[PDB]
């Protein structure tokens, strides 16, 4: 038999467990993503185009709903330059949406180094990365201007050729298409060198005004869910 307070303790524990059941249901019913990007990338426009208190906040959360599925995107706030310690807190995230400015050829090497660091991390080796090449119109204008060359920053651009599987957009200069495909290839050479089938990258081209990124994010999350279900079941 039990005492008088033991029954109340067991009742309280059962109530807390029944509440944690619904908590876990709500937690699994919602997906979490990690938004990353430099200051020159311009992720503020991507955050403000998503539809459903202290000034020293270091983390912002944006909740929206796509196809009856809730998504909570997390953006880094007031944090210092060192990002090697707290990044381990994002080990159980669904995907890492990394935004890269394409119109800035000077920081493309830094973006590639950051992508290599995130992809080759010991704790981030099982998390998929969704690449968003922002500012496509600015890159097109910079390529059509001709005041700056690309081979001065990347010699491989002088030897790269447009692949046959390319999908040129209607009414687009072939030079801009070749440049963006070269950038995509340079970004994917790092993801394909250490992939090993455990994780993959999702390259996407994002413009200034775009109202279709939500569906792309939803499709990428669905693909990641399918991949993890195939991996955990050993059908993979």
């Amino acid at each position: 038999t039990l005492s008088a307070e033991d029954k109340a303790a067991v009742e309280r524990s059962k109530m807390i467990e029944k509440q944690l059941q619904k908590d876990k249901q709500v937690y699994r019913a919602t997906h979490r993503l990690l938004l990353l990007g430099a200051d020159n990338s311009g992720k503020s426009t991507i955050v403000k185009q998503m539809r459903i208190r202290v000034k020293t906040s270091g983390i912002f959360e944006t909740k929206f709903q796509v196809d009856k599925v809730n998504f909570h995107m997390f953006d880094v706030g007031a944090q210092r330059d060192e990002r090697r310690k707290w990044i381990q807190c994002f080990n159980d995230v669904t995907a890492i949406i990394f935004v890269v400015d394409s119109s800035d050829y000077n920081r493309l090497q830094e973006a590639l180094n950051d992508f290599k660091s995130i992809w080759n991390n010991r704790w981030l080796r099982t998390i998929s990365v969704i690449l968003f090449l922002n500012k496509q119109d600015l890159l097109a204008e910079k390529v059509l201007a001709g005041k700056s060359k690309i081979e001065d920053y990347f010699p491989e651009f002088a030897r790269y050729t447009t692949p046959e599987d390319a999908t040129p957009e209607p009414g687009e200069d072939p030079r801009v298409t070749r440049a963006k495909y070269f950038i995509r290839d340079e970004f994917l050479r790092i993801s394909t060198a250490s992939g090993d089938g455990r994780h993959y990258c999702y390259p996407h081209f994002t413009c200034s005004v775009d109202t279709e990124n939500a569906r792309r994010i939803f499709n990428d999350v669905t693909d990641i869910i399918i991949k993890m279900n195939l991996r955990d079941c050993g059908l993979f």
Binding site: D165, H204, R216, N219, T222, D223, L230, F236
Partner: peptide, 18 residues
């Protein structure tokens, strides 16, 4: 269907094994 839904590169097939 999911693979073709997210604009995945064609003939990239890790699904051939399964």
């Amino acid at each position: 269907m999911v693979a073709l839904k997210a604009g995945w590169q064609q003939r990239k097939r890790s699904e051939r094994k399964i």
